[PDB]
């Protein structure tokens, strides 16, 4: 039988802080619901110690919703609010199976658009070079299509073992730190200032598979909204 996330106290507080949206942007879970033990084999505890989220299809998701702590509603900041807005997590990206193109892991979202996008991509050109198997970092500057309304950015090779992330938001500046060391370092975001609805996510998107079929599989070591304010 599968043994749910909830067994373990490691994740408990993000639990206490989070809806589950799953198979779509669609309720899944309640905060409440996760921490009472809910489980499939979209979200269960792997190896006694990994939070692991699966899922297939295209634009398919298995995603953890930042809410408002203790059976609160939707959460909703704004970049330039003046608090310092922080994610952490340690991801494990496995060997993902053929058909899987590109799985995202993180993200800062609003009511109508992603902010960023922290994704594992098999294969990708940026800025003349040839990527293969790697973190990259997706940025919107602007609502539009073209290449313009992007900042993509290499963040680091996929590796074997835990990959720790941090990403922090103030004063409509967003810097992301990977394995400790900042990779991006004050990127602006004030094409943003005055949206309060940005929110993080975090789990397993995915994005342009060839196979409707096949299953990404991303699994947490850790994972936390960090509170500046402790309230």
Not at 14 to 21: D, S, T
Not at 104 to 120: N, V
Not at 182 to 188: A, H, L
Request: glycine share 8%; aromatic share 10%.
């Amino acid at each position: 039988f599968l043994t749910a996330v909830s067994s373990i106290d490691t994740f408990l507080p993000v639990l206490n802080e989070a809806k589950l949206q799953w198979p779509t942007s669609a309720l899944a879970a309640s905060s409440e619901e996760l921490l009472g033990g809910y489980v499939g084999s979209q979200f269960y505890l792997q190896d006694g110690k990994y939070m692991q989220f699966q899922i297939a299809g295209s634009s398919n998701r298995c995603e953890l919703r930042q809410m408002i702590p203790d059976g609160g509603s939707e959460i909703g900041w704004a970049v330039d609010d003046g608090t310092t807005h922080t994610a952490t997590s340690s991801i494990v990206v496995p060997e993902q199976v053929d058909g899987v193109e590109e799985v995202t892991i993180m993200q800062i979202h609003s009511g109508e658009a992603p902010q960023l996008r922290i994704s594992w991509i098999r294969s990708k050109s940026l800025d003349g070079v040839a990527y293969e198997d790697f973190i990259m970092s997706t940025v919107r500057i602007g609502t539009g299509d073209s290449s313009d309304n992007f900042v993509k950015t290499h963040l680091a090779d996929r590796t074997a073992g835990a990959m720790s992330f941090q990403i922090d938001v103030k004063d409509s500046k967003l810097t992301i730190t990977v394995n400790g060391n900042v990779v991006v370092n004050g990127q602006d975001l004030s094409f943003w200032d005055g949206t309060d609805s940005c929110y993080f996510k975090a789990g397993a998107y995915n994005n342009n598979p060839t196979s409707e079929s096949a299953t990404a599989r991303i699994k947490f070591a850790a994972l936390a909204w960090v509170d500046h304010h402790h309230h």
